[PDB]
Symmetry: D2
Subunit: 243 residues, 4 copies
């Protein structure tokens, strides 16, 4: 399914990013997963073993981006599949939201998509084949109190993706977004009973999503069987929102 | 894979419906495909072989629906996956559109979705597992001059699907729409050389889609890897429209 | 603002339809409001007085539609502004939904839009000016358990409107949808405390909408100041849903 | 009318911003319009006369924002209506897009919306009344080749607006977006004869929009007749895109 393809998955330490990396490996890809520390990069190298490696990447630092891409090109080849998964939250109601909480979210969650996409596009255009998949959020579509920064970044990456899709579609490259709802992570596992119940009440499916479920959606769009899907957002949210 | 799941694909004679039926068989489903005539049903039985059967079905006729589902239950079992693919066009500008052209489109393309979905839901709710997937159209979301009837039906089945999705989500059933752009079939071949050039100019991918590309999307949603996707529309249109 | 214009408002007896009629009159229109009984038509004639009249109209009966339009053409002139407000509900979970509850909703809420729009379009096309505005619902966009019929009709009229908009836009006619959320009516006034509280919890604004608020939106789109809005849905729902 | 309401319109020198400012004055608002230079501010003061004032504002500079709002509070009072109209383009295909062209668009077109909205919200929350309206673009929803930066900002401000809308709705404040299609201004005049023909071919209305048509939409949302509209995008594009 992905035999001979090279994938770059940003933020592949755990959860969604790790499930994406593992799924792509399971279906034949060579995967480079990234973390913000050399130790995180080591842990990624450890689970990937013979099927890829971990590298330290800061998606807000241009020099870090060039270093990582040159390493990949030296050891593996040109990136066929880019999965923009790295992302953070800095929640606050707007009157409490600090300028840094705004700027860091825009930089890490939106400007990252610009930087990484631009860095891989030339080789994909030459090859007349490629996949760019960004992990958005239901919050980008519905909005959410206390997450106006996160919502701005997650909505903004859809506008970005639609525009890039229009630029590259004629050369067999697709550019799409997967938008998760509530996914079980270490964060949600630490919530109280009342807090989890409050989350579940929002989801018609009546459960949290799994990291693997997001990985399944990404792997579908990354495949040869999604060649006619571009500029699309695939919502994976148990019916929490419906558009 | 779909080992031991029973799928009903309406309108499986050719084009998108046939591609869906073949894909579901290849991945382990027992498939019942339908045509509007007994001769068409036999042709379906021929290609399905030991993995399924063709039946004559008119999706506008309640007696036909009832007879077909009883035949399926007697020979195979209860339907696990319903694919509402049957559909027609009756194109005209509104000023020329005949009552029959409106009504036949509503009955064939919209009311069919109600009738078939209702007819399979009880058993899916009992098993706490099910898939309903309806083939929509880009035209349902974009609109198209000369197709106000078709657009009404294809938009209407999205509203229907979101509502049903909300009713059944907590019992492990998903209800989704796959919305193709222009696909090379007997619905499209009838266009002129300049209509085809006009359509191609609207598609960033620079090509018509293939029937197998829609089948790939349907098969993804029908699978256990799409359990957290419900009330969603998956657009497969080469970038012709982006939402 | 509407001096010299003729408006037809279907279902103008009370609530939204009556507020629409009154607002259009207040801004200079001549208004014909419709009801399903001769007595309802009388009550409309009574509030409209010198600024229009009531007529008995059944939006599912073609002969009734021709009769009403011929009366309007004789007494007033050609319809400049059509507001499709007539609509019903027949709520039920899908396994309890009767065929008549499906068919009556499609006929009254969706096929009506086809019939009335077609009946007024020729004169608007000749005049190179016109407005068609249909009252949709938030349910058409979000879906709702127990309203799959209503949701199908309300979503279907958006697809219809987009297609018709594309057909007529070049001749200065716009075709739009106003989609209310929860509006205070006689129905909601009769609800229990717990029932009203359950509704309000869904609405960030924390109140029900007024019939006049929907009328304001319709009057805006009907005006000369909305000439560049077409194929659009204007959601008036206090933030109950956001697209 | 807006008797005794104070409106701030960013970028009111010409085009859409000027039309918005003039419309709000004509309907009784006291208007503060802004330009990036003192010479531009005087030109605004000239046209506003006794009904308002021009001020120099840079929406990327926190000190400029603070100074301007203090000037408004000292002379007029607290802002009741904020119209975020200031915006720029820095067009390029992604492969040629410079870091500056990305960053300046994000700062000017997206982060400005955060900064200005935050700066007026406290007083609106105290009064239990307010309007925030941001000028988006069709490109935010559709995407456009060569405008991935602009699209990211214009999509991003929708996510922002939905989130803020959710925070403030219960206190009688609305937060909405008006999304113009192609409007005859200094942003568009720079296109070639064949670009203009290419744009016109994409607009069913068969014409560019007027600046006053956007002002009409803004004025409707700013009014007391749009109290139940929040978190909404009002598309004013002649049918160029339909959602
Ligand atoms: N419910 C959920 O969890 C949902 C998550 N998402 C999205 O999924 C993605 C994964 O996040 P989440 O699920 O919270 O799980 P994590 O917090 O495990 O994933 C975030 C990853 O991003 C990396 N990262 C953070 N900052 C930077 C930076 N400056 N440069 C490079 N990498 C960075 C982290 O690296 P490190 O490991 O080195 O710290 C980490 O691997 C995000 O984009 C998030 O918005 C979307 C919808 C729902
Ligand atoms: N082709 C395209 O570009 C696109 C197609 N679609 C949708 O995809 C679906 C399949 O389209 P496509 O393969 O192109 O179409 P085809 O016309 O090739 O096939 C239509 C199928 O539906 C069956 N059918 C028609 N009427 C009825 C009825 N009353 N009861 C039961 N079955 C019926 C036909 O049966 P029989 O063989 O007996 O005539 C046939 O098997 C449709 O829903 C269509 O709207 C959507 C977007 C684009
Ligand atoms: N919360 C709400 O109330 C909302 C309502 N809407 C929509 O607003 C519209 C008004 O409905 P509602 O608010 O329930 O108030 P009403 O029930 O007062 O309005 C319905 C109107 O439709 C007329 N009508 C019913 N059947 C027919 C028919 N066959 N032919 C012609 N006219 C008919 C009725 O006529 P008569 O008076 O003669 O009985 C009545 O005037 C509907 O389209 C509804 O879907 C949308 C969103 C929210
Ligand atoms: N024209 C069109 O077709 C469309 C426009 N839009 C949007 O409409 C809005 C106005 O567009 P339009 O009238 O065409 O544009 P113009 O270029 O005519 O005007 C832009 C305005 O924004 C001001 N401005 C620019 N940068 C800054 C800054 N850093 N701080 C404060 N003010 C600034 C300008 O000030 P100065 O005069 O001092 O330079 C000017 O008043 C924009 O947000 C644009 O994206 C959306 C869709 C279509
Ligand atoms: Na989708
Ligand atoms: Na809208």
């Amino acid at each position: 399914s992905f035999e001979g393809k090279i994938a770059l998955v940003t933020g592949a330490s755990r959860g969604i990013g790790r499930a994406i990396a593992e799924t792509l490996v399971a279906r034949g890809a060579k995967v480079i997963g990234t973390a913000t520390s050399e130790n995180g990069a080591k842990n990624i190298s450890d689970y990937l073993g013979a099927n890829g490696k971990g590298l330290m990447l800061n998606v807000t630092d241009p020099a870090s981006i060039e270093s990582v891409l040159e390493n990949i090109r030296a050891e593996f080849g040109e990136v066929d599949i880019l999965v923009n998964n790295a992302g953070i939250t800095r929640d606050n109601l707007l009157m409490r939201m600090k300028d840094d909480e705004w700027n860091d979210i825009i930089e890490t969650n939106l400007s990252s998509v610009f930087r990484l996409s631009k860095a891989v596009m030339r080789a994909m255009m030459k090859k007349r084949c490629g996949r760019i998949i960004t992990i958005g959020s239901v919050v980008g579509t519905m909005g959410n109190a206390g997450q106006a920064n996160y919502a701005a970044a997650k909505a903004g990456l859809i506008g970005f993706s639609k525009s890039l899709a229009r630029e590259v579609a004629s050369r067999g490259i697709t550019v799409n977004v997967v938008a998760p709802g509530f996914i079980e992570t270490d964060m949600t596992r630490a919530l109280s009973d009342d807090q989890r119940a409050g989350i579940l009440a929002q989801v018609p499916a009546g459960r949290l999503g799994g990291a693997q479920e997001i990985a399944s959606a990404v792997a579908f769009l990354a495949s040869d069987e999604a060649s006619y899907i571009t500029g699309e957002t695939l919502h994976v949210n148990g019916g929490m929102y419906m558009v």
